[PDB]
């Protein structure tokens, strides 16, 4: 519609949750696999969401119009941040824990009893509670995620400039959206943008761990993720 129409970004989000049905199979009814280790559950959820992430990317205006090889570069550079942002937001409903896309509810201590504390505690303090305290809506999260997707500095990109311009198209729509919808709070736009530094440092520490799981293995991990996990 208008280059980066906020309505479609929300649609991309809506079109690929969660939302009924899914929030039951891995936290109340049956459940496949049957593993006995809690870092495994998150890695399983990540792998699953990787397929959906591609679906979402195609719905964000102008992504699928970009050169195919660029599309690949962007999803390989922002998948962990895009993913962390989704489950972080989905977890606002819960107090001190995370909600996976496979219906599993992971609790604080569990994260600790697995040696993944702190990094897990940062998500609750630096991401989840912040999104909760300012009550970011689904549209705002979609645009932030879009801003992240369209990262121009992703090594190898064919034409960086055109990616930066899309990201700017997103900045504008988000800002317009915030003023129209949240006139009572003038600095909401900057506040949404300042959610990104924590997503960034947290995402980097997350990739640090994953490669501290590849090198050692033992009951390895799902494909696609391993494919994403081959460093950029």
């Amino acid at each position: 519609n208008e280059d980066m129409p906020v309505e479609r970004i929300l649609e991309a989000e809506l079109a690929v949750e969660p939302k009924t049905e899914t929030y039951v199979e891995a936290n109340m009814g049956l459940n496949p696999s049957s593993p006995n280790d809690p870092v495994t559950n998150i890695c399983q959820a990540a792998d699953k969401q990787l397929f959906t992430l591609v679906e979402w990317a195609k719905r964000i205006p102008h992504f699928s119009e970009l050169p195919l090889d660029d599309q690949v570069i962007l999803l390989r550079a922002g998948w962990n941040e895009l993913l962390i942002a989704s489950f972080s937001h989905r977890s606002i409903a819960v107090k001190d824990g995370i909600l996976l896309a496979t219906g599993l509810h992971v609790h604080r201590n569990s994260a600790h009893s697995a040696g993944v504390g702190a990094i897990f505690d940062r998500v609750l303090t630096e991401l989840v509670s912040k999104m909760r305290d300012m009550q970011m809506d689904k549209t705002e999260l979609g645009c932030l995620r879009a801003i992240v997707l369209f990262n121009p500095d992703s090594k190898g990109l064919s034409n960086p400039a055109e990616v930066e311009a899309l990201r700017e198209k997103v900045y504008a729509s988000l800002e317009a959206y915030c003023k129209h919808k949240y006139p009572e709070q003038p600095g909401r736009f900057a506040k949404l943008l300042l959610r990104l530094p924590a997503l960034r440092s947290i995402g980097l520490k997350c990739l640090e761990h994953l490669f501290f799981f590849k090198l050692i293995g033992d009951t390895p991990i799902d494909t696609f993720l391993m494919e994403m996990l081959e460093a950029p």
Binding site: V54, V72, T223, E227, E230
Partner: peptide, 10 residues
Amino acid sequence: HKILHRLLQE
């Protein structure tokens, strides 16, 4: 990257 790539063009 086989998977990611296949999923992108359908």
